[model samples]
Structure formats: structure tokens, C-alpha cells
Target chain A: VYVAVLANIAGNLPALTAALSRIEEMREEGYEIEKYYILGNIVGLFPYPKEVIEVIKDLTKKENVKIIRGKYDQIIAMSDPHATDPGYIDKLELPGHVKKALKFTWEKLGHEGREYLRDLPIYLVDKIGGNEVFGVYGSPINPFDGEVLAEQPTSYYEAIMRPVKDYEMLIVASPMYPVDAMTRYGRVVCPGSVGFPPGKEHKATFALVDVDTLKPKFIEVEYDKKIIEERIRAEGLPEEIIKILYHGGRP
Target chain B: VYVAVLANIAGNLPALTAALSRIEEMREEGYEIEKYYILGNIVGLFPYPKEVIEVIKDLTKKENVKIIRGKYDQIIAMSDPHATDPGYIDKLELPGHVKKALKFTWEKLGHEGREYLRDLPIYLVDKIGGNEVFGVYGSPINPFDGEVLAEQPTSYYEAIMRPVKDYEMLIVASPMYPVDAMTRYGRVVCPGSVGFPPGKEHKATFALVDVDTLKPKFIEVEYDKKIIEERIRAEGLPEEIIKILYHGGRP
Candidate 1:
């Protein structure tokens, strides 16, 4: 059975590193993992080591993994000091001074800035086995809202079921650690997080799909949370944000 | 036995007036003509009589009709010199001279101007029979392309079917006088134009629906085409556009 894999790696090196290890582990376990979709939020929000991006980029070129630019990536790219989309600034509604400050900050970040994310493509639409399958970093029903935690869980069924009418399968990579599936005539699967679980399980979460049946088996890979926590502390990321990583909930 | 009345009255007074007659006709015939959705393009494309707006507005308040602003309405609203939306000017992307000329022209139009359309709501979303239903002026799948004749007809079914998974029914009123239905488990009904049949029957078009089954019937209402042609000529509209009305196809 062909397997479609999805993960939202929000620039956590340990989690991403562990996810890569899990991929190898899964392969060794004889899982037919044919396709991998890294559903956006690949970087940014929190400071990450420059080398981690290169590592992720390398993984993307593996002939199997495809990076779909998340809304975070789109917003970050739009807010870049060198954004080219003429409508970006007005759309964001940033005031003159704030716009100037944002540009200044983005410029200061150099290669690590949002501008670096312009290389990634936004969204993926494909036909798998003659069935239309759409891969998105966030909810396909509400594509504009790109935040990982912005979803109203009450409307999840409505949101998830909408895209499936046109598409046979919709794979979303958001709401990390909530690797869940809602199936009607079609299927909507959110593969959860590969990196930051944000106060949930320490295991890196993802999904392995049986393409024939269009069923997703949620997989949580064992990873050392202590190593990830230590790195967050070492990098001097804020304690409030770090606390959320230790315990997944609204900060 | 439910009639979902849609009229893209793009300032075609004869067609709009004819559609209003047809709605009454349907109601008299025992159809529960409850929901009247005026799918945008209400005015501004073709020069119209100033009084026609009032007539349309009066109908919308009749406890049956709801107006969903089309892109034309949005554009007209944005072009208003007294527009409150701060980003309107930037959003239009009109060049400096053209922008100035547009404002001058709109200001000259006085009461019969873009400012008048600003009072109308932009989109329509409601729950009917416990299923979400949305009404749009243009294609429910893609709102920007407003022309009824512009779609690649081969892709129409695919385009129309995609939105129905999330919304039980989508009523679009952009393509005038070619009342059509594309249905899967859900329905996408385009209750053709009350005005401006691109190139088809000279009759006005609309749709009647069975709310319980969500099935749509395309209805063509016979109107005085000669009188409409005479008015077009009398109003001194372009001969090219008038020719399309006479024959119902591109000149």
C-alpha cells in the first residue's frame, strides 16, 4: 500500500531530526512510504539554527518529500523587507512606522529572515489514482487562516468535509499533535506536528496513509523531549513559549 | 417546490423588470418563492436609469430578496470618492491619472454612482435545512471572473462541484440567461441572468428548486426582446453589446 506522510515541522531541530530518524525507522519496518508532504510552517516564529533549514531543504530534495508553504510562510514572506507582491503591505494594513520597523527587523535577520522562505511553493493539488487530492499546511476549508492553533474545533467537521467533496483526499498539516481524521464520502486528515507538540505528548506526531483505502494511521514517533527542552533553553527562547512546548495549550 | 430566485441584474432594466414579473408568476403557480438572492452586478456595468436602483432596493426589502454584492458592486463601491474602506484606493491598482479620472466621473454621476452600491452587503451565507448554503454573484468556486461566457465549459462541472462538499448548496448569479445546474450529492445552481443573455435564448433565465431534495430546474422566461433592443439603441449603448443581446453571442 502506498503511504502519504505529512508533518508540520515548525523549526524544532530535535523533533525534525527525530522525525527523519523515524522515517528511516519506518522504512526499515517495511512501511511503503512513497510520498512525504511537509505541510508549511517549516521555519520561523521561533529562532532556529541556520543548519536546520539546510537539513530540511536537503530532505525536501529526496524525490519523495514536497514542501508546501504554510500560511505562516506566506505571511512571513509577505512581511519580508523585500516582498515583491504589490498588494502585501496594504493587505497587512501596517502603519508607516510599523512597516518601517518590520522591514528593519527583517533586514537585521539577514538570511534567516522571512524573505528566505520565498523559495517555497504555496499549496499543492494533485491527482492520486485519478482522485483529486489536495495538500495544505492549514485547513483547506479556511485556507486564509494559517495559524496552527487558530481553528475552532467546534467547526472542524464542517471545515474538514468541505474540501473533500471536490477532492478525494485532503491532507492538512496543522494543529500539531492532533493527528486526526474526519471521513465522509471523502477524507480529511491532519497529520499533526513532527516538531513542536506544544505541551502535548513528547513523541513527534505524524500520519501514514493507506492510499488504496484512503485511511490514515496516526503515528507518534518516540523522541527525547529532554534534548529538545535543553536546546530551547540553550537558544534562550522565551520561557512562556518554552512552557507551551512542555505543555501543549494556549499560552 | 422552493424557488431560489437569482437575478444578476447588471443594469439591464428590461430583463430585471421582466425577472421581477417572472418571480410573481412563479409564486402564483404555487411555488414557495421564499428566497430571492440578487447575485451582485446590480448596477454600474451598463449605464442605467437612476430610478432602477430604488426599484431593486425596494424589492430587496420585500422580506424575500437578499442582495449579495458582486465584484462589480465591490468595484463600484471602491470607486466611490467618499468610500470609507481605507484600502480601497490601493486595492484597485488603477494608475494615477485613471484613478483621478474615475473619481471625477463617479463624483459627476452624483447620486447614480458607486457610492450608492456601498450600502449593499458583499456576500451571503446562511444555513438552510441544517445544511450551510452560500450565495455568490460570480462563480462560487472562483469569484473574480464575472463573465457568464468566460468559463471553460469543460471544467464547469469540476468548478461547480468543488464548493458543494462544504456548502450544501451554492447559488451563483453571474452568467445571465443560461440558467444551469451542476449537482453531485450537493448542488451548485447558477440561476442565469435576468439581464444580458450573452448569446442564447432571448428569454430571461432563473431557477426553481425543491428545497427538500435540493434539485434545481432551469427556467427561461419569455420577455419582449424587441423592446429591450429598442431601449438599448435609444440609450445609445455600444452597437457591439446590443448585437450580443439581439443574437445572444459574442459579436
Candidate 2:
């Protein structure tokens, strides 16, 4: 069975829209993109935090898209930033700009949106075609904070992967950078940053896999990055945040 | 790409062996059985809980198989009934004989096996034939103790399934009655009890589904029952346990 996989879309509406629209397009070409997986971070520092969550929530009305909670996604959902409290979002010891982005995100997501995110599964293990795919927002070592990437290989991953070594594909949301490679373990992939591509790969990224051969076809869709830059400019979000959003060195 | 799916194997080694052995035989015919899904309750009232965990654990060396924790599976893992901890199992409010089987099974499994069950995925969401398939140990509402059945229609299931209505196929582990039905929501199925099937079925049960068609083929394998009866008698376990094991009802 053919399916679409993506991760770390922290509320870049146009980019996620571009990715979803692209997946919709694949259906016309006889590719039945039936299952869509979002590896968390649906809300954070981009346009339309509530809108992004709304779109995803509705899609799950049919469960067409499956999502797991990302580290920051976990924070935003489980917090009490409504007025009386900062909850986890306020207590995060990050910089002012980062806090601004986080607070803005939590406010936008209000009650129902935050509650929706509250109860999502932390990790998902499913069969794509005939392969066992493990989708998580972070690495095994650090469920909330850890991230796994392919370009910067680590034996630490090798050590942790020993228990679940049977999984044919490992997908993570961290590094917000898209990289896919066949490790000594198996196919280790970060399906390019869904909302924001890494600094080097300045485009919206995701992956499609044919289960029989277990090969990845990472897709890069170009959305207008300037739109997000302009919104951040008006919102007075951190210049540093914009750099991470548009240029994407770190998130 | 083909795979096997089964749930509710409560420590019946011969039945589980018969099921696994059949799957292995399919591979010889070039089925390429790339994955096996056990839906939970790995340790329950049966003859060989320890052996079962050891066998399933070794298979994961290559991750050819994927498992999700069932209600009783997690209960056993989370409980410490043998010594200082009676934990949740003792607090379960179940009947006396049922508790005996649980304690018996847990003690036999010991710490090593119990720890293994401590951390299986609660549920699985994967793509099979481009269809979103959800495999849960129990009904969504009462994950620790819930059952969904197609034949025994319940709106309670429909209400619970509303959260996951998008899944084209819902496979559950409760009610081990080996029932599959088409509902207004989607295809709902219990892959049948791998060990002890229900009253009239009188066989070890499991299921194979063709993702493209979204249809289930329930499989029943016959193994010697008398040997298990002899063992239970020798162990001097409760008579109710034997009835549930052999006849397969109301576990």
C-alpha cells in the first residue's frame, strides 16, 4: 500500500497546505495516498496554530491522518496558559522570543484545540504495505526532547535501536531537517521538515515510500516562505524565530 | 506484502505455536510474511506464559514482528501481586477464580517476562493496502477492559469508535469470540483468540485480512486440548480456569 509520511509541522499553514494538497494530487495519478501520517508539532510558531489544529482534527474525523505528540506539541497541549497560568509553556526555560512564539501558539489553540492535542498517542507503530513503520516525535532515549536524524549518525541510536531492531523503518520529527538513509539497522528517515525545510533544503519536505522495495521518495514542495516571514514581522515574533522558520538552522 | 494479525493469546503455547507454525509454513510457499501483529494479553491463564514471552521476544531481534500491549498484558506488567505489590490486578474487582489465574500467570512469567510487557505500544495505526488500520487491545473508551464485536452489535462500540471512525478496519482483542462484521462505521473485527476461542468455535483462532479488499479471513487451527487439561490438573489450578481455557468463554 502507498502512503504519505511527514513530521514537525509547527503551524506553517501554507506549507502544510502545500504538502496536503500535493498528497491530494497524487490520487489523480493512480497513486491512492490513503494514509497520511504527521509526526507531531502541529502547533508552535507559524501562522494559524488553531487553523492547523482544526484542519488536522477534522481530517481525523475520518482518521485519514494519524498524528503523535511532539515535544513542544506535548507542552502546548498539556499547559494552562489561558490567563491564570503559564503551565508548561511559560515555565520552559527558553529565550524571550521562543517564549513569545510558545505563548502565542498556546493562546491561539485555546481550550478544545489544546485538549485535542492532550490525548494523542506519544508514538505510533503501524504497517505500511507490508513493513512495520515506527513513527515518533522524538528518539527512544528522550521521548519528549530527543530527536533522531540520518545525516549525523550516532551509535547512541544503534544502542537504543537494539530492542526494536525488527522495525524496518524508523521515522522521527526532530532536527526539523529532512534526511533519509539506510542505516546498518534499517531505513532511518526524517521525512524532511514538513512545515519548514532545513536551512540548506529551503522547501517544504515529506516522503512517499513503496513498501515492496522499502525505498523512499522524499518530496520537496516550494511554498511562499516570504508569507511566514511577513507574518512574523507584523506579529513581532522573535527575529531569531523567523530565521529558524525561514532559514531553519534550529527550531 | 502479506502479514498475520491475531489477538488475545492468553498463554496457550500449543495454540500459539500452531498459529506461528502455520505462518512460517506460508513463508515457505513464498508469502514473504514480513510482519506479525499480536494484539495483547500475551500472559494470561494458560500453561506456558514464560515460554510465550521468550519466544515473542526473540522474534523481535530483526523486528519481523510487532506487538501492542493488551489489557491483561499491561495489567500483569503493571501489577506486583506476588510480594509487596498487589497493584491494579488485585484491585481489579474481578471474581476470585479470575484473580487466581491472573496471579498464577503473572508469577509464572516472573519479573523478566513482566518487564517485557511493561512497554508495548498501547495501540497501532498503520497503513495496509493504503487503508488506515487501527489495532487496539480493547475498545477505545475502556482500554484496560473493553471489547468490540460486529455480531453482537452494541452502540457503545459505535460511540467509542466515533473517535477513530476514519479507520477502514478496526481490529480488537476483547470478546475473543472470533467475530468479524461490517458496520456503518467501518469493518470491525476481533482477530479471534489465538489460544482459547469462545464456546462453540472450539478451535484456536486468528485472522488474515486483505487490505485491498478490507476483508477478513478468520483462521482456526486445532491442537491437542487434553494435554493442557492434564497440565492444569497437575498444577491444581481452579476448575473455572480450565473451562475458560478449553471452552473459551467469559475470560
Candidate 3:
């Protein structure tokens, strides 16, 4: 074992896996390896079990060097988290927010539009621009209901999130394809995945609309789309949104 | 609709899976399949649980099929003795005269070559024919200790195996591999995996002789091996043994 090159072990691994050929060049003549030493808070917290240590001890007994037992935590902690559900969002902390958003949106929106929302196929909604799709909230109802519902902010909000109760809205958008609200609902509000601090906080920003009149309200925009874009990529939905947008909105 | 084939639904299938073909064959212009049903056994054992059944019921209901909730026996019958230890041999019924012949031979041989005998491997010693390699009733000294022991004819008829006594000679064999005895000796007895009968009993035949004496007084001849060989490609060691024997009188 001459040397070990270990880096680029994060992000959408497809991009990182692309660098494997260079790492292969540094490996000892016939020993290419892809092992990663996972580091934990403290070394040795994941010490090798007695049985494993014994095997390794027996292996090195013939060497002149002493085989001292040390911390083996990092040696074992490295694993592909994608192998399990928990690992899919490991350290990223997104499932809770996504689930909450889905549930809250469903209850607030009510049952009338549930058929079109809950368990919505990821492929149906097409992207308009920058990997973003303008989702017209709720199903088509009687014009009288739609007008009455649209007149009141709460009712309009309720229509959008029919099945979900007052949930903080998460504007899941792709940086490559951003959509303008006017294109679909005349006026729109794209909040964020989690609450205040972007992808981490699970609080919802109040919709940019009149609470009583239920009419779409306009607000002066301040922040650049880059900040929102960062949150989108961090939560790991950028690619799917980009692909869907490329297919001209929904499938 | 005619016949059709479907490939892997999960991309993460094992490497051994082969590519499937001919999926388009099911369609024939405008007169294609209007409806279809795919059936599979709901394995009620192993990984099955109430949730799995509920999922099946829900899916069938969605497909507008007559969903039936079938009940099954929760308790397994306890009457079949073979149910637990499937191949238990109750009474092998070996002739009394043959038993006597073995006992008589062992008693005459007695405790002389136990040390050298213990060092010999079973596969090697088995080539030695009965009587020729032994001392008359080759009573060899116990390999574990140097206790000289004589074989007792009556001991073969005892229920429950006797503990290793200083002056005792053990002769154990059965119509199948004697897993219990070999495992007691801390040896790999047989291959037991899914689709295989599992352990020694499923094996064709087996023999257990005194560790110090090469003479195999207790032996089991597989009556099924010859007939089973004609049914499928030969498996296990018997086929190989016959091949070797066919090639030479001795290896």
C-alpha cells in the first residue's frame, strides 16, 4: 500500500464518482481501492470488537512491529447511508420538513383537491423556467366556489393547500429553472423548504397575500435567487426539478 | 393480448439476474389488452405481517377487483414428530448378528495404536478395509487419554449416548451424516443452506468410528444414492467417490 487518495466523497455522488479515475492512478500498481475512513466525534469510540482485534492481532503477530490496539471508530463508521431510509437524509435533516410540509399543505388545502395533490406523481407537473414549475394550487371547483374562495385570503390559501391545514409553505424550486407566479396564479409566493433559516428551520413564512380579502398581494422582493437556490440544492431536489423542467414542466 | 415479459423493476438487483425480453409481444395493434391480472403468492410465513396483507388488500381494491380477506390457521400442528427435527430416525433395526460381529472385532483389536491412529485423517483411514488395518478387535487406546478400551457388544443398544469414559469405545453411524457426533468433535459436518436438506441427516450416509481405531464398526450405506443418481446430475461426494473408484483400485 504505497498511498491512499481519499476525497470528493460528498454531494450528488455521481459528480464525485466521476473523479475516481484520477484516484485510481495513485493506487499501488495492482491495488485500486475505494475505501473511505469515516470520522466520528472521537477516535476509538467505535473500537474493534475483541473477536476482530484478535484476528488482526494474529495477522500481524509475525511482524517485528508491535500490534497495539487503538481507536477503530473511523475505520468502521464509513458507510453509504443511502443503503437505508435514515441515511438518505443523514445530517441533511429534510425528511421531517418535507413530511410536515406535505401533511400541513394537504390538511390546509382540504379534501377537494386532494386527488390532484396527495401522492402526486413527481413527473406530472412540468417546469416552466429555471427548473421551476408554477403549481396552480388545488383542483378546479365550481366558478362560484372558486370566486368566493379566492375572495378570502384564508379560503384562497385553503384552496391551494386543500388537504393540509395551516402548514408553512415550502417553495421547492430548482436554480436552473425558476418560475414566475404570474404565469400560473397571477400572483404567487415561493417561500422555502424549511422555515426561517432556509433548509433547516421548519417554520413557514406567511403567504404574501391579504389574510381577509383573500386576494393575491404584491410585495417588494429583496433577496437574490442565489440564496434560495442554495437552499434548494442543499435539500437535494435540484436535479429532479431540473429534469422535470427540461421535459417542459410536468410529465 | 398475447404473452409479454417484464424486466427488473428495481435497478439494484443482484448481479446474477439476467436480462428479460419480449415485453411488446403482449400488444396487437388497436385490439390490445383491456384488462389484466398478475398473481403472486402472499408468503404468510417468514417476512409476512399484517401490514403486508393490508397493502395487498388496498392495491386490489384500487384495481377494482373483488378483494377477499382470507383467514389462515395461526397455529402449526405439533403431531408430526418430523416437523421439528425433520429426519429423526427412530428405529433403524440393524440385525443383532451384524452388531455382534462389530463388537467382537473391536474387543479383539484393543488399545495399541491409538496415538498414530488419532493423527490419521478420516478420508485417508477410510480407505483401509475392515479387519486388515486393525489389531482382530482393534481395541485402540483413547486418543484423548491413553486409556485402553475394549468394545462392548451390548453398548450399541443403549439409549442416549454415553459420556466419554476412560475405558469406553464409541461406534456411531447412521443412514445419514451423523451431524451431532461430528459437531461434538468440532468439525464441519455438512453443507446446510437454503434448498439443501440442512446438516448431517440430509446427507446420504455417514460413519463414526473410534477416534483412535480406524475400524468403522458402525456404518450407514445410502440406499437412495444409486436411484437418486439416475434422476439428476450427481451431487455430493458419492458420485465423486464412484468416479475415483472406477478409475483406480487405490488412490
Candidate 4:
């Protein structure tokens, strides 16, 4: 049995739909799929469409699929103005009450929304048989500078793997790169983005893990960037986000 | 095959566990359990215990269970001051970061969290073999008065059953009462609470719906409340809430 782990969907409906369809294809091939873990960042840097939210709600409604809220999800839900910029909700044409709710959410979240990021589960530690797999939403940050450390450290590994550092595996989503580390404690893996791949790579990213072997295989699916680029332009997203997605570089 | 609908768990872990155990017993007897829809209000009034959160998360991870966010859930997540009152998180002995997250959530929610309630999906219309089962988190409300209308109007029904008006069944969970309506449109039901029973009926409430027959059987399970009451007192929850649970009345 193996588990499918997805992270940083970020409201790319086309990419998300494509990825799920592929997973469904895998399921149809008679794979003994154990479970699916949607490691957060499902929505951020863009206002989520109702259609996309409905797709997620419907998908998660299926048996054996669970979603963990990421730091970006919490941030936008907290009403961070930066998260809502470009007025995504205004163009949604939602009902009056819904519009009011969205406005209220942004008002309350204000600038303090980032403070609630700590509320999200730092890691999803899944215990299968005697072995375990851990998942987190972000890269390890330097304790002193409070910045995502350029280098991975034993201290970072220990901090996230605490309470039960003897786990067989660990996976993370925030680093936006397919990377891994082997500590004296356990092995750590970060399955990169399914949408908004960093750098010059324009492909949507994902991963498949063998629960028995605890091995992760990262994969990328090719999609027409022209379609997505048109969507970004039509949706009126900030030019900065568009540039990042097109040129593939840190904003 | 039948669907089990649970609502208003309200952080009552004991009742939630008891209800699930009973369902498990039924499944053991060879009932075709299709799926479970946990209709919101998962937490509120009572601060959630970490153990309960873990159980809910683990259960939702299974393929057969799906949880929907309720009005109270959005409120707490947003940081509504009214919802966070009585300091439930503080007593939990959670880490400093976790506590800050909870507090920040409430701050962001403010009193406007209720505005978003209208945005919540009132029904999950299942279209299977042309037989549809609609699931909602709350009773149908009158847009004019913002009240859960005692009388069902065709206009209101049509508005909620959007994109399609015909459904074999409609289920809801917010009213905390096992009530139903047969309108010209279709049947609507509120399965009631799986945790806090109302109006002096201290029994836990839930419902079973036949997909083919579209019949709903409301069920009540008896469990010991002494332990729950003692725990509530020990946990320092508001005396008023404890009294409401014991007396089965609105606080």
C-alpha cells in the first residue's frame, strides 16, 4: 500500500483537477491506495474560486482523503489584506451575504492574520503499522533569525520531529523544492508545489510515496502555460504573481 | 446502503465517541454504511480537547467520513471575541504558539464571523443514478428575517436547491432538533445533535437515511453523563454550559 501526498495546490483548479484525474487513473489500475494527505497551501496568492472550493469539498468528501490547513490557507482565511489584494472576491459575483462575509473576514484578519499561522498543525504524523510518516506545511526556520534557514540543520529536524523523533519518515511542503534530509532521528522529505513551481520550471509538481518502503518519488505534469497565463490575465491577478509564474523566479 | 448524518458535535467528545461506537456495532451487523457527513458546529460552547481533535482528524482521514465546517467553527477560526470567551484554550495547557494561534484566530473573526454563515453550503446535492440526496449544515433560513423559517417557501427552497430543484432527500444539522418538512419541492430534515440533546432529552441524537427509500430514522443513544459533567467541571468550563447539557435546554 502506498500514500499520495499533495501540497501547495494554491487554487490552480486546472492543475488540481488534472492531478486528481491522474490519481484516479492510478486507482483504476488496481493500486492498493491506503490514503491521501492534502498538505495545505490549497489557496493563497489568489482569491479562491467557488468552483475550486466546491471541487475540494467534493474531493475530500470521498473516503480516504484528508486535507491539512497550510500556513498560507490560515493566512488568507485570517483576512490578511495582502492575501486578498487585487480584489478576488469582488469579482466573484457572490450573493450579498457571502460578499459581506468575505469583507468581514478581511476586516477581522487585517494585518494580524500572520499571528494565527502558529495554530495550524506543525506536522501530520501518520502511523502505519509500526512505522510512521510525518508531514509539515513549511520549511524549518532558523530559531535565531526566525527566517527560513538557507541550510537544513539537525536542530531543525529535531524541532519538527519532537515528541516522537523516532518516526520512519517526514514530509514537508513550504520549501517549494523537492528536497530531503537524513538525520540521526529520521528521514525528511519535502514534495514541492503542484501549482506555481518556483524558478524557471513551469510544470506542476507532485509526489508518490511507498508506505511500506517509505520512499518518495517526485513527479511533474506538463500543462499548457498559455491557458493558465490567459487565466491569470483575465482574473486580474497582480502583475507580480503573473511574472513569477511565467518567468519562474522568486518575487 | 444508508448515510449517517451527525451534527452539532459541539466539542462533546464522549457523545461523539458513543455515537460512533454504536454506528460501528451496526456496521458489524452488515449494514451497508455508505458515508458520514459531520455537519459542522464540531466545536463551540465547549473547548475542544486535543484528544477529540485527534480522533476527528483520524476519523476524517478514513474514506468513509467527511466533515463540514459550521458557523461556530468559522467564528472560532476567525477569532470572534464572543466565541473565545471563557478561555477554553488556556486551560488546555497547549504550547505558547498554539495558544497565540487560537487567540489570533478569534481576533480575526471578530463579531462579523456570522456574516459568512450565509456563504456556507446549505446542502450537498448528490446526483447518483438520478437519485439525489442533499446535505446541508443548517436549517433553511428566511433571507428577509435571517431566521430559520418554520414554514418552507417554494422561493426559499428553490434558492437553496440551486442549479437543480429536484432531489430525493435533503438533510441538515444545525437546529439541534430532529425535525423535517415535506414541501412541494422535496423532503428536508435536521438530524439533530450527536452531542448535546435539546429540551431536557439528555440523549445523544443522530439520523439514518435510506438512499433508495429516502426514509429517515432518527435515533437516540443513551450514555452516562456523570463522567462528562465531572470532566466539564474539572476542565473549568462555564457552569452555565454544564447546566445546559444536564438539563437539555438552551443556555
Best by lDDT: 2
TM-score (0 to 1) for chain B of model 2: 0.88
DockQ of each candidate relative to the true complex: 0.04, 0.04, 0.00, 0.02
Candidate 1, B1-251: lDDT as tens digits: 47566666655677777777777877788877766666666653344535457677687677566666665556555453555433454456654433332343344346545545655644465655566666656653345343444344534544444423456776666655544455453566677666656665667777776667667677776776676567656654556555566666410
Task: Judging by lDDT, tell me the better candidate of 3 and 4.
Answer: 4
Give the clashing residue pairs of candidate 4, or none.
Answer: A63-B63, A64-B63, A199-A248, B78-B105, B78-B109, B79-B105, B79-B106, B79-B107, B124-B135, B200-B248
Candidate 1 lDDT tens digits, A1-251 = 55556565655677777777877787898887777767766654334535456786687677566666665455555453444433454456544433332333344346555545655644465555566676666553344353334244534443444423556776766665554444453666677777656565667777777767777777777766676567657755555545556676320
Residue B6 of model 1: what lDDT? 60
- Residue B115's lDDT in candidate 4: 29
Model 3 interface RMSD, in angstroms?
A: 39.6
Off by over 4 Å in 4: A1-251, B80-125, B139-166
Tens digits of per-residue lDDT, candidate 2, A1-251, equal 46688787888888888888887787787876657788877777775788787778777786567788776676675454255545555567666676788777777666777767765766667777777887667764355666565556555454445334568877778856665666566666677777755675478888887767667688888787778889888877878877686556555
C-alpha TM-scores of all predictions: 0.48, 0.52, 0.15, 0.41
- Model 4 residue A72 distance off true place after TM-score fit, in angstroms: 35
Error of 2 at A213 (Å): 31
lDDT of 2 by residue, B1-251 (tens): 56588777778888888888887787788765567778877877776888888778777785567688776676675554346444456678788777777877776766676667765766566777788877767765345566565465655455445445667777788767666667666777777888755775377788777757767777778887778788888987889877776555655
